[PDB]
Design a protein around this ligand. Structure first.
Ligand SMILES: *[C@@H](O)[C@H](C[C@@H]1CCNC1=O)NC(=O)[C@H](CC(C)C)NC(=O)OC[C@H]1C[C@H]2C=CC[C@H](C2)C1
Ligand SMILES: *[C@@H](O)[C@H](C[C@@H]1CCNC1=O)NC(=O)[C@H](CC(C)C)NC(=O)OC[C@H]1C[C@H]2C=CC[C@H](C2)C1
Lengths: 299, 299
């Protein structure tokens, strides 16, 4: 089951940011509010914005930052890649311990979908290999963030900026660098062909083994290079060394070597399921990370 | 986009505490100056095999209950039992108490679960009350006292408190008056549920969601009467569709231009032919834990 992180620590950081009649969400940490820089655009500006020129025309007093109906006075501003940073005169007393991280494809995170600075729902997303996410985002959702929580610390990894023709979503890290080859312009853009997240499928197979569903374990092994070359013919991602390493704990727990599991997956790709199921499904699941399998099979 | 989405959990996170009696620890819900929790906290492992709860409870004193909110012990100054829930009066009001109600939900209705361990929130997810009054949750040892809820405006409606897992892996619990959903008892003995059925009005909502998101492969030119649909639905262990259900689906029908009974004829075809390998909103199975309201809210 997809399980999100408890959202309270992030809810306490959500604000709204308005420039003119353009409103979206911002993230208030200490005395800085982070938000998408296209808040400075009119609808017509978005077709072909010159952000440097648009921002030179702005001053601190052109930005309306609100926590609910309570205005936070803006005392400084700057642009960092595709994010605006607004210094405000109040440090957020609900600021959690936090970090800004840039995630890899395959990593999952919780999204707190917000409208007008108000949280509406929380759900789990996986960053696809084509650097899109299958979100649920409507008009006004920009500036909603994705995050993971480890012990005390919220790791912010995603800020929402746009939807693509195919219905999927694109955005940046909290330094304003897009995931993928997208730009914050209201122009026709296309997500490239997606692929299956191999490291997560392997995590799912380990989860199946942990729960006693292990008919697919075969008697073979493989090399990582051989496996990578075969898997790409099935539109699966190649594994990295870091992938092998993050499967370590599940490999240790089950006693199944990573490359033996790779050989088992290879046989599933080459010969199919043959009518059988795994964890009550004939589809291989690729949106649970090794950490997610551990998270859920533990507490 | 369309995603299984939970309510933001912050208002509930600020109510979760840890309750300890003997070697038994679970979670409580702290509202104003009362902590609510499952009464089986008062049982030893031996007591749980066949507890006479009124007899066990009369023998406890206030100081037998250790309530911890974070690193802070709250002193218990009174205790009573309401059906299967224990109410501990404490000497401190929870300053984070939200506006709240206690409600008893109907089978087929959805809610969000905040899974907690040792009074600390661990994850949030969306559940439905099944027709057989189980829930397909993700609960581990120590999760008891986790609650299910819905949020409307500023108001949290608590509808579920977690008590147990069945041999089949599904879960059972009570409302906040301590009455179980279903024919279950808080005794450590193997218990089976009634035959489950599929929540038909929810499957139809999800099929409409799939259209709203541009997928209509499963539609057809046929139609059906309500009764002839219900004959087929019951044959496949689907719940009957009422005229209230038809009405409740009106907004989705209007939006998409697909009459409710036309979508019923679509579902009838899916039930009689299967999906022939295809998928809907990424699922190889018909999903029945989105209500019409859930779909509408998110679309
Ligand atoms: C937040 O400002 C907003 C969120 C999106 C609106 C609908 N769903 C979203 O996720 N972002 C934008 O409106 C964005 C601003 C540009 C400056 C980057 N543009 C955008 O997302 O365009 C998508 C629109 C327009 C058509 C194109 C593709 C999808 C769909 C039709 C919605
Ligand atoms: C909370 O105290 C705890 C939560 C469950 C533990 C495992 N998953 C849960 O949801 N509740 C209990 O342990 C409960 C106490 C009784 C007094 C009502 N009993 C229970 O849930 O039994 C199920 C356990 C024990 C074995 C029997 C069948 C299923 C499985 C093995 C889990």
């Amino acid at each position: 089951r997809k399980m999100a992180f408890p959202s309270g620590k992030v809810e306490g950081c959500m604000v709204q940011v308005t420039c003119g009649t353009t409103t979206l969400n911002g993230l208030w940490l200490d005395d800085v509010v982070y938000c998408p820089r296209h808040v400075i655009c009119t609808s017509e500006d978005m077709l072909n914005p010159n952000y440097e020129d648009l921002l030179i025309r702005k001053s601190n007093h052109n930005f309306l930052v609100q926590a609910g109906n309570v205005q936070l006075r803006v005392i400084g501003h700057s642009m960092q890649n595709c994010v605006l940073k607004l210094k405000v005169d109040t440090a957020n007393p609900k600021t959690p311990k936090y970090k800004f991280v840039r995630i890899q494809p395959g990593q999952t995170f919780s999204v707190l979908a917000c409208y007008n600075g108000s949280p509406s729902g929380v759900y789990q997303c996986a960053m696809r290999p084509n650097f899109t996410i299958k979100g649920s985002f409507l008009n006004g959702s920009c500036g909603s963030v994705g995050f993971n929580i480890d012990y005390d610390c919220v790791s912010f990894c995603y800020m929402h900026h746009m939807e693509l023709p195919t219905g999927v979503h694109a955005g940046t890290d909290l330094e304003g660098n897009f995931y993928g080859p997208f730009v914050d312009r209201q122009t026709a853009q296309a997500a490239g062909t997606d692929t299956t997240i191999t490291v997560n499928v392997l995590a799912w197979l380990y989860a199946a083994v942990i729960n006693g569903d292990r008919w697919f374990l075969n008697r073979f092994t493989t090399t990582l290079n051989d496996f990578n070359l075969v898997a790409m013919k099935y539109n699966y991602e190649p594994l990295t060394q870091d992938h092998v390493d993050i499967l370590g704990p599940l490999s240790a727990q089950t006693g199944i070597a990573v490359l033996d599991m790779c050989a088992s997956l290879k046989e599933l790709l080459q010969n199919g399921m043959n009518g059988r199921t795994i964890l009550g499904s004939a589809l291989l699941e690729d949106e649970f990370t090794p950490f997610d399998v551990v998270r859920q099979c533990s507490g």
